[PDB]
């Protein structure tokens, strides 16, 4: 089904996480490798020669080995394998296109976005540009029936597209966490600094687990109900960046070959929500994609010509992490109480919904 696209956005996941990083040492990061990765798949269906290679070569492909005609292809099977799923799992994703009112956008892009990347693009006046902002906001606001803030705050009115990508998630655990289990304990920013935190807590719990005494860390899967997974990243105390520097996908392979199902004795995860707002610009030049932004941008597939490039590419990212899994709720010893990774996986392609670091649960 998806063994090569698969490959691809893993290796995209890890570039992205550390360029991330780079940007925010210590800090927090969410981010969703899958929805980056449809965005700027998206955005080369309307891109030609050098900036198209350099989108490819930027989101991980191997051009020796596929083609842009072969990957469109293969995204649009893998974006309708999840539009599969039950409403055990619910995966609110969005991928929107904001481009100056005054260049045509010929029907045959909009066409192929919608039927190959369920996106599609719009004309938008970028002169009356508080006006802009109030509708390209509007955009992300329907990606949730709960509210959230402005994704779009300062927007040139010189403005020529901006790229909008966003994700929200819904799934259950198949292992709830007990409210009445739900206490006060300490969360280590540092060996010496700490803070209070809601922990969850599981007892007796026979799961996927693995001790990795090469990379000092341990692993542990937890299930959804849909067919998916959070693998939760527990570093050795000081140990995080020596973690972080072997973070690929042969690692990820690795981790993932050698967990073992075991009983748990005691097992304590935060109760928390984390969410990222990014301005990708900095990142995408970071990983190679440079003619998309300026003059000698060949976007001709969207307009029929080269008279456009990319002015600013916005992502969101709100995963929660409850009792029941995202919604809220009425001896071998995991103590999740340290600085920690989360990556959450889908089983039936093997791609990244969230790539995550949480260095403190309530900032």
Same mark, same amino acid.
């Given at each position: ?41 998206? &955005? %080369? =269906?309307?891109?030609?020669? !050098?900036?198209?290679?350099?989108? #490819?070569? /930027?989101?991980?492909?191997?051009? +020796? ?37 005054? &260049? %045509? =956008?010929?029907?045959?892009? !909009?066409?192929?976005?919608?039927? #190959?990347? /369920?996106?599609?693009?719009?004309? +938008? ?37 901006? &790229? ?200």
């Amino acid at each position: 089904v998806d063994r090569g696209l698969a490959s691809a956005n893993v290796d995209f996941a890890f570039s992205l996480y550390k360029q991330l990083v780079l940007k925010a040492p210590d800090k927090n990061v969410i981010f969703s490798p899958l929805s980056i990765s449809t965005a700027l798949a998206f &955005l %080369s =269906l309307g891109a030609h020669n !050098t900036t198209l290679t350099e989108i #490819l070569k /930027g989101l991980k492909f191997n051009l +020796t080995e596929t083609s842009e005609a072969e990957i469109h292809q293969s995204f649009q099977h893998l974006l309708r394998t999840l539009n599969q799923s039950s409403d055990e799992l619910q995966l609110s994703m969005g991928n929107a296109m904001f481009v100056k009112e005054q &260049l %045509s =956008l010929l029907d045959r892009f !909009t066409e192929d976005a919608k039927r #190959l990347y /369920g996106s599609e693009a719009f004309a +938008t006046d970028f002169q009356d540009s508080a006006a802009a902002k109030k509708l390209i906001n509007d955009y992300v606001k329907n990606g949730t029936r709960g509210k959230i803030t402005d994704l779009i705050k300062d927007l040139d009115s010189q403005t020529m597209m901006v &790229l909008v990508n966003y994700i929200f998630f819904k799934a259950k655990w198949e292992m709830p966490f007990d409210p009445q289990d739900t206490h006060q304990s300490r969360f280590y920013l540092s060996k010496k600094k700490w803070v209070m935190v809601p922990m969850m807590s599981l007892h007796h719990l026979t799961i996927p687990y693995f001790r990795d005494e090469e990379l000092s860390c341990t692993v542990v899967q937890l299930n959804y109900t849909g067919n998916a997974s959070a693998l939760f990243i527990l570093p050795d105390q000081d140990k995080m960046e020596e973690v972080e520097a072997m973070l690929s996908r042969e690692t990820l392979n690795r981790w993932g070959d050698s967990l073992e199902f075991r009983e748990i004795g005691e097992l304590y995860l935060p109760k928390f929500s984390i969410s990222r707002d990014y301005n990708l610009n900095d990142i995408l030049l970071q990983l190679g994609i440079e003619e998309a932004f300026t003059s000698k941008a060949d976007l001709s597939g969207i307009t029929g010509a080269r008279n456009l490039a990319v002015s600013q590419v916005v992502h969101k990212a709100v995963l929660d992490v409850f009792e029941e899994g995202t919604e809220a709720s009425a001896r071998t010893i995991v103590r999740f109480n340290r600085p920690f990774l989360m990556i959450i996986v889908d089983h039936f392609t093997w791609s990244i919904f969230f790539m995550s670091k949480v260095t403190n649960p309530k900032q």
